[PDB]
Amino acid sequence: GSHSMRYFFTSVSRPGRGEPRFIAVGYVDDTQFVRFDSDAASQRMEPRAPWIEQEGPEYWDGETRKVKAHSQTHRVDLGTLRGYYNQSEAGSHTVQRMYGCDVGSDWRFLRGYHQYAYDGKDYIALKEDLRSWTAADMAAQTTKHKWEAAHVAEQLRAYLEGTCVEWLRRYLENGKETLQRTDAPKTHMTHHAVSDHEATLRCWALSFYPAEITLTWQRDGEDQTQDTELVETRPAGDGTFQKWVAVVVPSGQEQRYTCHVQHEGLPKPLTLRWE
């Protein structure tokens, strides 16, 4: 199906001594492949997926060069945003950047992204046309003017429509064994009696990749969201994900309820019952 490459960048000022804590991570789909941490000893961009290790010394030198240039930019930004917002030297503050490209099943440009936050709030984002900007406030309007003059949008659109999608295609190919493999949910159902009259049924989905999944309850063939609980999809830690959804039902009536599971790795949707 479709794929994506995203880079996430977090910088956190340290007041009193020295530079910001800076962390960078790269993802293809739901798989992390690269990282830089300003506090690690190596001071190099580091592999996190075996298929990136195929890439050689020059790639790593260049990715290190650029991720350090990103962190300096962020250092300057934290200083400038402090002024912009009339803030003190004492507060710790955060900048966040995200960028990336999405591609359809054919692997052709669908969508590009570039967005920036200060203390967890929208600051400035590239609009979907990749030609103009959403500046959340007057500080970000100033930033917006500066980036229009310096034609940031035209530079990023070229990376996003061009470079980003070319390197994703190469990553997909090199990492095919895993990146182009879907792992279907291992499903099962559990039962718990809260009291003499009230049961809880829980429908589990495990070991699936990618993370996108849909889990729902039906009653007598109709959707039931009332008295149901859904957990956030969570990483297992081995590269796969887990979710469950649960419904509370009258004791004895467990056979009216069915769990429905939808995922890319199933050629058709699954239905589960409590036997």
């Binding site: 880079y7 790269g26 790639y59 260049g62 990715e63 650029k66 991720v67 240039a69 990103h70 930019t73 300057v76 930004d77 400038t80 945003l81 912009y84 950047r97 960028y99 570039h114 920036y116 600051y123 400035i124 970000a140 930033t143 500066k146 980036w147 310096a150 940031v152 949008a153 530079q155 990023l156 070229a158 990376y159 470079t163 980003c164 390197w167």
Partner: peptide, 10 residues
């Protein structure tokens, strides 16, 4: 790969 261009200061 990371963007080489268009990461400017605010």
């Amino acid at each position: 790969e990371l963007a080489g261009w268009g990461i400017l200061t605010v």
